[PDB]
Amino acid sequence: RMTVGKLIELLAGKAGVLDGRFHYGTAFGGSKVKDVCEDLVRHGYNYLGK
Amino acid sequence: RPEVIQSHSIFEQGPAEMMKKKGNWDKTVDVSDMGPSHIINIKKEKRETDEETKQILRMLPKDVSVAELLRELSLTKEEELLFLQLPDTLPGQPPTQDIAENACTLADLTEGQVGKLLIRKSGRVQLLLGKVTLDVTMGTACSFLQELVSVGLGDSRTGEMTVLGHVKHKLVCSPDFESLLDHKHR
Amino acid sequence: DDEEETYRLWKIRKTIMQLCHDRGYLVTQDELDQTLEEFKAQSGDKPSEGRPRRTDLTVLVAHNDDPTDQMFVFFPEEPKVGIKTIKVYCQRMQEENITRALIVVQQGMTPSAKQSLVDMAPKYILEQFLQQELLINITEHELVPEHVVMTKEEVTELLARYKLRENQLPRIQAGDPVARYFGIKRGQVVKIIRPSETAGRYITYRLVQ
Amino acid sequence: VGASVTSSTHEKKSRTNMAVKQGRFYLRHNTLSEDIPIVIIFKAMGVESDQEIVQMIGTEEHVMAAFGPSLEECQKAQIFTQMQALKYIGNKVRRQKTKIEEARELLASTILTHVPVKEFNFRAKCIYTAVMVRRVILAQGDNKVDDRDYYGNKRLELAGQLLSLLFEDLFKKFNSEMKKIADQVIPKQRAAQFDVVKHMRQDQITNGMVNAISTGNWSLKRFKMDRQGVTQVLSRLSYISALGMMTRISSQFEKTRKVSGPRSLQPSQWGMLCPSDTPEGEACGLVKNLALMTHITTDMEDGPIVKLASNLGVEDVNLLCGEELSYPNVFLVFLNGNILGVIRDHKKLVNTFRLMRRAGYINEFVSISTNLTDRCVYISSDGGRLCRPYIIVKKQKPAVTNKHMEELAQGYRNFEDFLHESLVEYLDVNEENDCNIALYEHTINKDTTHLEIEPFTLLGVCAGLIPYPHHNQSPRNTYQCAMGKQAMGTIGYNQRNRIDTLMYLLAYPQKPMVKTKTIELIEFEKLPAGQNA
Amino acid sequence: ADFDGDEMNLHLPQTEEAKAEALVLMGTKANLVTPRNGEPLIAAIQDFLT
Amino acid sequence: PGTQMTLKTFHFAGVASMNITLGVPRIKEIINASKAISTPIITAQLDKDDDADYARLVKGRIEKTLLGEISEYIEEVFLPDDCFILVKLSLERIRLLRLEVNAETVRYSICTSKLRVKPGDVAVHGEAVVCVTPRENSKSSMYYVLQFLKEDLPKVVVQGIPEVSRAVIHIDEQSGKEKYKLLVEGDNLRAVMATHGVKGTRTTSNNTYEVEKTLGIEAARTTIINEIQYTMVNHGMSIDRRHVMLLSDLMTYKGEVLGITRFGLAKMKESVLMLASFEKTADHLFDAAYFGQKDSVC
Amino acid sequence: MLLFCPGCGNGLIVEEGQRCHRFSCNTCPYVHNITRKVTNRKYPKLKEVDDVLGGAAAWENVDSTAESCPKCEHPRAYFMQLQTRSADEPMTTFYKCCNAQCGHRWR
Amino acid sequence: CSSQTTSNTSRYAAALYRQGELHLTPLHGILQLRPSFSYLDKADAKHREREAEQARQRRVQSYEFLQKKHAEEPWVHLHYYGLRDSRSEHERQYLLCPGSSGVENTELVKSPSEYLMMLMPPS
Amino acid sequence: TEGRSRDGGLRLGEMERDCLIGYGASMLLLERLMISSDAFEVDVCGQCGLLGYSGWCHYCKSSCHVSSLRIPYACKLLFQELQSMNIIPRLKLSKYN
Amino acid sequence: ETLEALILKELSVIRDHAGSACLRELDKSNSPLTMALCGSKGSFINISQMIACVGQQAISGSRVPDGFENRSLPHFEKHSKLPAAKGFVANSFYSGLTPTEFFFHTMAGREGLVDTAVKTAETGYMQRRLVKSLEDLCSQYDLTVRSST
Amino acid sequence: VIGILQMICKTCCHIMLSQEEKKQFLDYLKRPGLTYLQKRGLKKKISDKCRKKNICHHCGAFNGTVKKCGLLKIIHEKYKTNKKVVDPIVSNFLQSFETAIEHNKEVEPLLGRAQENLNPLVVLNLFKRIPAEDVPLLLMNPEAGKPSDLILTRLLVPPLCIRPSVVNEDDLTMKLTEIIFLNDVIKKHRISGAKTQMIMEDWDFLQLQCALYINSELSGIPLNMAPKKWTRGFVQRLKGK
Ligand SMILES: [Mg+2]
Ligand SMILES: [Zn+2]
Ligand SMILES: [Zn+2]
Ligand SMILES: [Zn+2]
């Protein structure tokens, strides 16, 4: 089905709860995965969510 | 009707075809210029397209206003008639006509000089009419008769007709809305 | 031209004579391989050849069972046959006292003749073909499985085996090309031997109706 | 090949045809007993010299050759002057001085009804049919058959457009019923005078409407037609269900048969209709939803346009003869399908007309565009057609600058201000066919004339609830649209007072942890419909 | 079928004669292979192959 | 499989041309056995394939060729005493076509279904030209009939066998042996196979009704089996051969190709109540009663 | 080409009633006497000449030069070409090859 | 036979160009001429004669009413003079208007500002 | 009946009918389509071939030639209509041996 | 069509080589790869599209047709023939589509949905006629298959 | 009806055929194993072979063509004028209208349109006289019915079972009550001895309504009485999904 959109949502959400924020997933925009992963490693979690 | 036919495909002679056609259709009898067969060359039937009315012989080009007038001045300097159509209403107000805000018209003006025609480098044209400039361009080209005439009603019962000439070109005159906006911003 | 015409003549003669061989009439092996140059030797070029008479053939007989049973082949010349020509054929027939003859038309014939072809006589039967058909022998084509007509005894045996009544058999149309080729009337039965995709074989039967 | 026009005005809806069944042309209309060769209509029409008809159609040799056959039948028939032609088409009149005037009247007022004429100066209608024929003959040159799906040719109607016809019918019927009873009473019932106020039947209007709205059937004897299923019960499953419904579009085709046509997606929809949101199943493609940023126009005055157009040099049509049309340098000028004159140097006309619009003299929604294959300029003013706003670009620099956005954010000015100052303008499907649009600033080149305000506004209101839609495969987005409506959630702050046939709620809902900007525009997160797992 | 919200019917034959036919002829055990060409149709599906 | 058919693309023999019907529409086409179809295709062999002898011309002898370009120009000849039509011939161009046509053949081709103009009305002044003389037919006709005599170059009615056209590339990959073919888009098997210089005995058609009329039933039912199997396999679905053998037998056991439709089914079966349950419920019943038909229940 | 009468503007017709043919009107006595020849027709119409000489027709058109195939190059296909539609449009070339069990015919 | 083209002709003016000067004149009207085909109708009429509480008025829209209206107007006849006649040059003298070459026109006082909304009145 | 507010009942569509002719299960699709849906009993007079009532044929005024049967209701309904359209289905019956 | 054939050839080999390259770089034990190899779910084409490069969007077996006059979207110049102006998508789902690509992708996807909806009736009808004629035939003890009569 | 009426000699009610052909087709009918399809084909064959004849050999009686003159209206063409020599019979028929020609002038323009109209009464009293030996050649089995009964004069009202109380009542009921109502109208109306014209016009509407009872699809209904609403005739409840 190639719903990569769900795989990103699950990571942006995780990195968003931990620091009290809402992330945006707007069409043709939204939070880039290159920033979200560097947010997670700050909180002691692995930078790809596994 | 024949059925046994052996065709041929070997190369033939072009001048032979020309000679055959010559013999078939070039045996002219035009020497039969008898009275009832005479044709006045100025009375021919005519091609559909007016510009190419030369279907049998005895045996338009691009233009621009600056060109037209300057040939009408340099190459020729005789008189000519032109038909031009002006904007709905002119810059003037109705002169002491007592007016509904009626548009002024040439029918309501006096005689004499009324303005100047200005030709600019690169062939741009403007009609200097009072305080405003109106752009001018040639109109749709014509190929049919347009005769200018004067209708003299000499009496209530009868009058007189005289042809004055024919019209060869048309001109279109328009306000320059861009210029008016530039002068008075909105 | 006159070489394509002779080619057509050669081919149609080949086919007609092959057909007569297949119906089981007298024919000589040395004719079977009559080559186109052999035809040119026996018959000259088109302008010298009289179509309506050069190719007529009646030597064929039903030697298989009756050497005294003869038949005719005719090659009319006019594009459409008329009543007079078929009457000429039928009176020639009466002079030779024969019951069967073949007809070939280059293009066709009058509908009046078409109507007549059903009612010459019960004892006189005339079969019509078109030049553009016999120019190929349909029996030689790959999509046509081998048809073999069989006698009354064989059909008796067959429908005794399966307990059939003859009307329960599948049908072959009376006017079908192959049936008309073999010249089989109503009520005859034909065996078909289909070529299997493999070395095996399948048999089926059809009733002429 | 053939051509037809569904000539329609305020009074009646009609149509006409042409046919090429053998090579000559003929006019087909319902009230004419048999098709008439075109040249016969032209001679009856008031122009009889064949030379002039050929001038009307064209001068180029092959078009004239292909028209040729279409006048041999004429010269076979003993039909040489106008009067004979009116007699001929009089004999051919169909009915549900008859031989002379009645047939003239029908032609004058029943054929090509939408183009007008007053004093039997039918030159105008001659040109119109001459254009119409010139299309068919030239159309055989290349198989560029018209695509009826192109949205430049689609109009939309609303509550007002519909209610108007219904009320006008009822009001006319109210007068007519008051009429015939008024006629019946006074002459016979009583010598002393009566008064109508004793017969103001009140129930007739009220009933006429409410049963029409409730039943959704709009029978009208005026047009001998009926429209079904024009209203639906508002759906209240969830907040987004009602909001979604209030932007839906229906279609006239009504599932009559499979044609593999309008169900597909054509680029004409760009920015006007949502790509992702369509009903799944048998209705797929017949039902559509408006994009997020769109406008539907309304009727205009039409006055100052025709006046202004006449000033910009367009000549009157009837002052010139047929031979002019074939020249390669003259363009025609239309107005809502009507012919308005002839012009040369069109690009000046278009450029000035756009500029006057930007200055605010002509209404904002009036559109002007060019067709180069037919060399016609189409000016359009009728309402019901869609529009989008774009930022204007000149010489590779946008009109709007950070200062303006600062002003707007602080609050000095408002959207409408950007319109007078010629910073943004409304484009229309037929007009955005002409310009070049830039998608982002860094893609601007020498020629871009407009710039998108925000590309994410391409999607609709239901489809804007997906996060990261541009990372999924397309069918997935279409499925979510239809299931977002069925979710269970909140409805509105008065939901505890509603008594309604069926209502689903959720106990402890929550707002999304990953949210789109369309979610904030429609206030979705004030009425959420889910829970984070 | 796919367990995405599907539905299925069910009938209970009412005659001893109909029980015998349903079991002998229509049973799954007797129908492991499709009659179109004889290939198997009842076999392992995803997440058993992995 | 019929419902499973997805109507896949790139079925164009790898050449993106020859838009033959395929998929469920082709299946309907075969089952219905309607005597008229779209895009019929015939194939043939002659003797040998490639380079420099005896083959390619045959192509130009049966496929499409207007009169047209064989005249470089068509020009008027009016002259005070009379006028007539002229047609030029480009013999040199013909030779490059090497169609066997010449002036005399064109002469013979005219006078077929053309206003009964006699051979004396037509004249040939040279191998490069042909001319025809106008005549008044008096049936709404006069000397000016010239316009209705404008019936010579592209389209009125013509010599040759009509209903044929062209065909295009279809290459092969297996170079281990040399193998090629001639295709034809037409609707006359009898004629094409009957042409001189073609190995007729291996021609076929994809129109079942066409083959029946020309080679008997057995050729017909073999065509049906071939075409079903070719369609299914092309779309990648596998079916046993014993299912298609039985379908073809049932369709062709009564002596004719009976289509599986209302007309054919009425011709196959006999019960009135069975027919009434399928289609045409009104007429079958009323007609049954009139005939007093007694029906078993089997 | 077409003509209209200068006097009345209708189409001319061609007829003969005297020693010399004439271009005449049908409503007014204007006429022109044709003494010369005019050279442009209406391009008449007759359908596709396909099987004029179908099949292995006469051998007079044999020729020497021929092309060759890129793949196999077996000894039997000599050249031929054909035309499109009418007097004023181009002519086409096809290279068709045919032994058995294939589909070749190159454009 | 003549045919009318437009009702108002105000915005049309004839012109005569000359070296160093150009003279205008308002047009009184424009008309189109076509050959008259009434004679076939006359022939038809001759052949045919040889062979052998009122409802709401609608006469305003009927053609023969216009004919009757146009018949009220009497005919006037006119003496023709061709271009070959010197009378034509005699008449042509009237196109030139006398006066000083350089004159400041009293009219056309309106400035470009006034002219813009003058020709474009408020909607 | 068919509804869900009304008590329901599912359908053996024409596709299911054909699947059971796929298996050749002759007694199952007699049971499903007749025994469980609309079984019915009627009286037919063998002498005149058309149905009567209560073992008495009003057409013949006799009871010596009546015999009962079991036939689906919808087929009995069909015989009523046809006999009303003046197309009579005179049915002839015999012992079951 | 010569040009189209050449452009389609080039724009297909671009995706193939990008598809091969990613798969060779793809470490074993990767999940989509495990599913693809064992045949439980997916295929190699899916993996290439999710990572490397979405293909050439095609409608009815051809590049995107002209929808406006001489172009597919106003965002491109007249008479252009370059890849992007006719439906090519150089963006893998991981890196997201740009607005015009997303539109062409939706345009290509919709055909499948309409197709599936349409196919409901035609094949049902074919099956109804076909079975209604064939139902009686039954194999016998005599090995013949015989019609009802 | 039109098929059978095209066969019969209008003078003697016989089939028109040669005795040899009668014997031949009798023997054809005696062929065993007659099939429905063969019945149809034979009907076509006999119709084709019979239509050629125009004289009844049994009594020398001439017969003309039979053709539908109007919707549910039939006409025979015995008294037809021909381009060939005028038949004495048609001249005798033509010359007999002098009285009406004198009374009314519009008779003269259309005296050539006088043919034999077919009404239920005349067909019924014709069919009744067909002889027994002929029927099976007409392919309708004499055990199934007789032509005389093909034209109807009575109807059954179906039981209340096949038309429940609440449809208020079924449309078949409302149709039937209308038929009887209109029937009662005719009988009282004719007894009331009014002008002929209505008596027959009233009968045509009854004919159409009786037709409309069986089936409700007929498209030939003129404008000013076409049903404004759709209705369930018999075939509508047999046919349909
Ligand atoms: Mg599912
Ligand atoms: Zn004239
Ligand atoms: Zn009884
Ligand atoms: Zn008799």
Swiss-Prot record, chain C:
Component of the RNA polymerase I (Pol I), RNA polymerase II (Pol II) and RNA polymerase III (Pol III) complexes consisting of at least 13, 12 and 17 subunits, respectively. Pol I complex consists of a ten-subunit catalytic core composed of POLR1A/RPA1, POLR1B/RPA2, POLR1C/RPAC1, POLR1D/RPAC2, POLR1H/RPA12, POLR2E/RPABC1, POLR2F/RPABC2, POLR2H/RPABC3, POLR2K/RPABC4 and POLR2L/RPABC5; a mobile stalk subunit POLR1F/RPA43 protruding from the core and additional subunits homologous to general transcription factors POLR1E/RPA49 and POLR1G/RPA34. PANTHER family: DNA-DIRECTED RNA POLYMERASES I, II, AND III SUBUNIT RPABC1. This is DNA-directed RNA polymerases I, II, and III subunit RPABC1. GO terms for cellular component: cytosol; nucleoplasm; nucleus; RNA polymerase I complex; RNA polymerase II, core complex; RNA polymerase III complex; RPAP3/R2TP/prefoldin-like complex. It is found in: Nucleus; Nucleus, Nucleolus. The gene is POLR2E. The lineage of its organism: Eukaryota, Metazoa, Chordata, Craniata, Vertebrata. It comes from the Eukaryota. HAMAP family: RNApol_Rpo5_RPB5. Belongs to the archaeal Rpo5/eukaryotic RPB5 RNA polymerase subunit family.
Swiss-Prot record, chain D:
Signal peptide: none annotated. It comes from the Eukaryota. RNA binds at R15, Q232, Q486. DNA nontemplate strand binds at D226. Changing L220S: In CMT1I; affects RNA polymerase III assembly; no effect on nuclear localization. It is found in: Nucleus; Cytoplasm, Cytosol. The record marks F223 as: Critical in trapping poly(dT) in Pol III-mediated transcription termination. Changing A159V: In CMT1I; affects RNA polymerase III assembly; no effect on nuclear localization. Catalytic core component of RNA polymerase III (Pol III), a DNA-dependent RNA polymerase which synthesizes small non-coding RNAs using the four ribonucleoside triphosphates as substrates. Synthesizes 5S rRNA, snRNAs, tRNAs and miRNAs from at least 500 distinct genomic loci. Pol III-mediated transcription cycle proceeds through transcription initiation, transcription elongation and transcription termination stages. During transcription initiation, Pol III is recruited to DNA promoters type I, II or III with the help of general transcription factors and other specific initiation factors. Belongs to the RNA polymerase beta chain family. This is DNA-directed RNA polymerase III subunit RPC2. It comes from Homo sapiens. The gene is POLR3B.
Swiss-Prot record, chain G:
The keyword Metal-binding applies. InterPro entries: DNA-dir_RNA_pol-M_15_CS, Rpa12/Rpb9/Rpc10/TFS, Zn_ribbon_RPB9, Zn_ribbon_RPC11_C, Znf_TFIIS. This is DNA-directed RNA polymerase III subunit RPC10. It comes from the Eukaryota. PANTHER family: DNA-DIRECTED RNA POLYMERASE, DNA-DIRECTED RNA POLYMERASE III SUBUNIT RPC10. Belongs to the archaeal RpoM/eukaryotic RPA12/RPB9/RPC11 RNA polymerase family. GO terms for cellular component: cytosol; nucleoplasm; RNA polymerase III complex. GO terms for molecular function: DNA-directed RNA polymerase activity; nucleic acid binding; zinc ion binding. Its main location: nucleus. Component of the RNA polymerase III complex consisting of 17 subunits: a ten-subunit horseshoe-shaped catalytic core composed of POLR3A/RPC1, POLR3B/RPC2, POLR1C/RPAC1, POLR1D/RPAC2, POLR3K/RPC10, POLR2E/RPABC1, POLR2F/RPABC2, POLR2H/RPABC3, POLR2K/RPABC4 and POLR2L/RPABC5; a mobile stalk composed of two subunits POLR3H/RPC8 and CRCP/RPC9, protruding from the core and functioning primarily in transcription initiation; and additional subunits homologous to general transcription factors of the RNA polymerase II machinery, POLR3C/RPC3-POLR3F/RPC6-POLR3G/RPC7 heterotrimer required for transcription initiation and POLR3D/RPC4-POLR3E/RPC5 heterodimer involved in both transcription initiation and termination. A motif (Hairpin) lies at residues 88-89. Pfam families: Zn_ribbon_RPB9, Zn_ribbon_TFIIS. Transmembrane segments: none annotated. It is found in: Nucleus. SMART domains: RPOL9 (SM00661), ZnF_C2C2 (SM00440). A zinc finger (C4-type) spans 5-28. Zn(2+) 2 binds at C69, C72, C98, C102.
UniProtKB/Swiss-Prot annotation, chain J:
It comes from Homo sapiens (Human). Expressed in the brain, in the cortex and the white matter (at protein level). The gene is POLR3A. This is DNA-directed RNA polymerase III subunit RPC1. It is found in: Nucleus; Cytoplasm, Cytosol. Belongs to the RNA polymerase beta' chain family. Residues 98-139 are annotated as: Bridging helix. Component of the RNA polymerase III (Pol III) (Pol III) complex consisting of 17 subunits: a ten-subunit catalytic core composed of POLR3A/RPC1, POLR3B/RPC2, POLR1C/RPAC1, POLR1D/RPAC2, POLR3K/RPC10, POLR2E/RPABC1, POLR2F/RPABC2, POLR2H/RPABC3, POLR2K/RPABC4 and POLR2L/RPABC5; a mobile stalk composed of two subunits POLR3H/RPC8 and CRCP/RPC9, protruding from the core and functioning primarily in transcription initiation; and additional subunits homologous to general transcription factors of the RNA polymerase II machinery, POLR3C/RPC3-POLR3F/RPC6-POLR3G/RPC7 heterotrimer required for transcription initiation and POLR3D/RPC4-POLR3E/RPC5 heterodimer involved in both transcription initiation and termination. The chain holds residues 746 to 894 of 1390 of the full protein.
